[PDB]
Design a protein around this nucleic acid. Structure first.
Lengths: 200, 212
RNA sequence: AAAA
């Protein structure tokens, strides 16, 4: 079970693609935030989405309208919605107004809930990230960790154990949860490259 | 001197509006990131921009072209550009590809640099929100139980002078001043009026709402 | 790539 949290523009097909790609189920939650007032294009897109959801056995959408006047007053409404969504929260920034997508994006990050955000090339190519990515980039690494990463960066991958001079691993599984390295040779991933780049 | 970091689509109007609303100077770094390869509508918007920039003594744009294969690979390239921009970084995410603007936004936050982001209304309207680095750091800060006790009081009294706050919290005014100065750095409270009553602003309300 |  999961939650979809998106805004809606004039084209419901972006959301239909997201719902099928991630195998949406009826038990899931679908929450659509739209600007106030609801313009004709957005309303038509919602009715078009209702008819197509009712055929495909998807979850019924809940629609929230919010005025977009102040960054904090609008974030306040986005946050109240977010605390009512069970994790993980699936989001896609390719559709709807940029202002509202910005508030959704910032809303899930500061809420510290689990999430997966997708962003597409126009509506073919696609990139994604999650709460683990953001937390791995926002983390203040200690020097025991930082100089271990810098060694892995310079050695490119127990030969490691006789460099920092320790025993022979509990920290390895801890850093594998942050997705910054893998594991035989301990291999640093691209996310770890960004880690080191942020703290050099 | 400031710096501007934006991406470009087919329309330069929002960038020229940004430059006009923030009083852009010729000594500023204007940096534009575009996808690779540069398509013809983006080449045309960039030529339309340079003509108007020269006539208004705006900064000349330095243009970088980025490939976007993977999230981490593309962010890596955005960070290289960000980490050579002088602070503060002024950005406007209402233009160009959404993928690039997401990386620009995410790149700026994690670079811990100073910034102001604008996001406008596509339909041309006057609706516009903005935020800055203190905004994000405020919402993500780990607030101690003691710090939360102080914020909870300002919400229930709606403004209280330093002397009464020190009484309500069983602390010295000397130590309350230092703590109020530290919270003021994050932008979550202000102290206006001739009575110097400490008050929670809208940002402080969101901070309190996150810890319930 | 201005509710794509």
């Amino acid at each position: 079970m999961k939650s979809y949290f998106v805004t809606m523009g004039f084209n419901e097909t972006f959301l239909l693609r997201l719902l099928n790609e991630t195998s949406a189920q009826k038990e899931d939650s679908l929450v659509i935030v739209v600007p106030s007032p609801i313009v004709s294009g957005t309303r038509a897109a919602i009715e078009s989405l209702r008819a197509q959801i009712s055929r495909l056995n998807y979850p019924p959408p809940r629609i929230y309208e919010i005025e977009i006047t102040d960054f904090n007053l609008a974030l306040s409404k986005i946050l109240d919605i977010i605390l009512t969504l069970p994790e993980p929260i699936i989001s896609d920034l390719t559709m709807g107004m940029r202002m509202i997508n910005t508030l959704i994006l910032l809303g899930i990050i500061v809420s510290r809930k689990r999430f997966t955000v997708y962003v597409r090339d126009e509506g073919s190519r696609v990139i994604s990230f999650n709460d683990n990515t953001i937390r791995a980039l926002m983390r203040d690494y200690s020097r025991e960790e930082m100089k271990l990463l810098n060694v892995l960066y310079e050695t490119k991958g127990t030969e490691l154990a006789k460099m920092l001079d320790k025993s022979e691993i509990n920290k390895i599984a801890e850093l594998k949860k942050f997705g910054i390295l893998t594991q035989r040779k301990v291999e640093l991933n691209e996310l770890g490259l960004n880690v080191i780049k942020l703290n050099k």
